[PDB]
């Protein structure tokens, strides 16, 4: 697994070389599909290793949702030093996996035949995606996970081929996804940055480090935030704000080159506040007009050395739209709100306009690149600041 483009050129991709993606290091100047829409699709599921079987996870069954939570809680993404692991909650998983248009056959699980234990997963959800001058119905792929005891046995390529087949059956032939590893071939490369909210805890669990020329007392003063936000008229998003949030987001996203195209129903799903999942605040001015909004989702991480201890509480910048409030002010209030709600750290990528505030608001650069990818769509790559899409 190459995490660097230099590593990636010294690697061969036995699976990805067979897929309709551009080759690494080839410069793309065209825009369109690699292969045509298929007018007949394999009806039979791909073959799994002996002893494993496919299943479609109906998350409306609480027991099945808990099985998925447990698979991910124990086997999903860890940080580069294997000290933290994502701890997606069941309620978050419902938010991320049942948006408008979701299909249970696109919650694609692998179970042990004899025990029925869940040991692998991958998911698709539908999304309309604007990529340069084209809008395409696509899927977003997420939650690719193979049990630690099943790794390095070529199960991930089978999971990818099977979700591909199941998406093809529904008439969809493009996808978007992110990954921490370099594959053929990123359409954009983004970097996470981090803003300490509770510096004492971040240093104690070694999420961050004391600068060695700075004391703890000094670090606490440096990152201290006001107790209340400064922007006039900031308040939680409400049902009555759904249309204007939709309108604000649609107009704001036009300036980027890879963006979602959301219906008003999708806007309600992705932004309407749900405690411990998604937070959205709007700025309603002295005229009663909503002019700006900020949003972040809740994604804690298990502290692997102390599974007993409370998870590390992280907020992830989602979509932030400014038309009257300066973005710097909007994000300052996002930090204060996250601190108020008990988060330890606030995370943001360097995409969209985020580079204009990261250093000024005392974010520090993170240790991993997030690559963005399109499947069966060959187009030029773009800089992070033109990426306008944030996944979970």
């Amino acid at each position: 697994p190459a995490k660097t483009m230099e590593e990636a050129s010294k690697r061969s991709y036995q699976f990805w070389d067979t897929q309709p993606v551009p080759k690494l290091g080839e410069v793309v100047n065209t825009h369109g599909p690699v292969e045509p829409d298929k007018d007949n699709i394999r009806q039979e599921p791909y073959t799994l290793p002996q002893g494993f079987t496919w299943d479609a996870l109906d998350l409306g069954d609480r027991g099945v949702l808990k099985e998925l939570y447990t698979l991910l809680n124990e086997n999903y993404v860890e940080d580069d030093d294997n000290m933290f692991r994502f701890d997606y909650s069941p309620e978050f998983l419902l938010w991320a996996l049942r948006p408008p248009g979701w299909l249970p056959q696109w919650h694609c699980g692998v179970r042990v035949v004899s025990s029925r234990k869940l040991v692998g997963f991958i998911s698709a959800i539908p999304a309309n995606i604007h990529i340069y001058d084209t809008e395409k119905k696509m899927v977003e792929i997420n939650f690719l996970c193979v049990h630690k005891k099943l790794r390095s046995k070529r199960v991930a390529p089978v999971l990818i081929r099977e979700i591909t087949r199941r998406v093809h059956l529904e008439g969809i032939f493009q996808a978007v996804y992110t990954a921490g590893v370099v594959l053929p071939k990123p359409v954009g490369t983004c970097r996470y940055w981090h803003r300490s909210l509770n510096p004492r805890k971040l240093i104690e669990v070694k999420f961050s480090h004391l600068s060695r020329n700075m004391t703890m007392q000094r670090t606490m003063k440096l990152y201290r935030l006001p107790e209340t936000p400064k922007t006039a008229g900031l308040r939680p998003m409400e049902t009555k704000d759904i249309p204007v949030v939709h309108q604000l987001l649609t107009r704001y996203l036009k300036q980027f080159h890879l963006t979602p195209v959301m219906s008003q129903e999708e806007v309600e799903h992705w932004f309407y506040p749900q405690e411990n999942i998604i937070d959205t605040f709007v700025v309603e001015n002295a005229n009663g007009e909503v002019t700006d909004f900020l949003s972040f989702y809740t994604l804690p991480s298990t502290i692997m050395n102390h599974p007993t201890h409370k998870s590390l509480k992280a907020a992830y910048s989602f979509y932030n739209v400014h038309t009257q409030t300066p973005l710097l002010d909007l994000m300052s209030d996002a930090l204060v709100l996250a601190k108020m709600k008990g988060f330890d750290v606030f995370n943001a990528l360097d995409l969209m306009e985020n580079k204009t505030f990261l250093e000024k608001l005392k974010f520090g650069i993170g240790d991993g690149n997030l690559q963005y990818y399109l499947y069966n769509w060959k187009c030029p790559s773009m800089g992070a600041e033109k990426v306008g899409l944030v996944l979970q």
Binding site: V77, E78, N142, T178, A179, G364, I365, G366, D367, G368
Partner: peptide
């Protein structure tokens, strides 16, 4: 999927 990053 997402990436779990921390301070460089």
């Amino acid at each position: 999927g997402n990436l779990l990053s921390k301070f460089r």
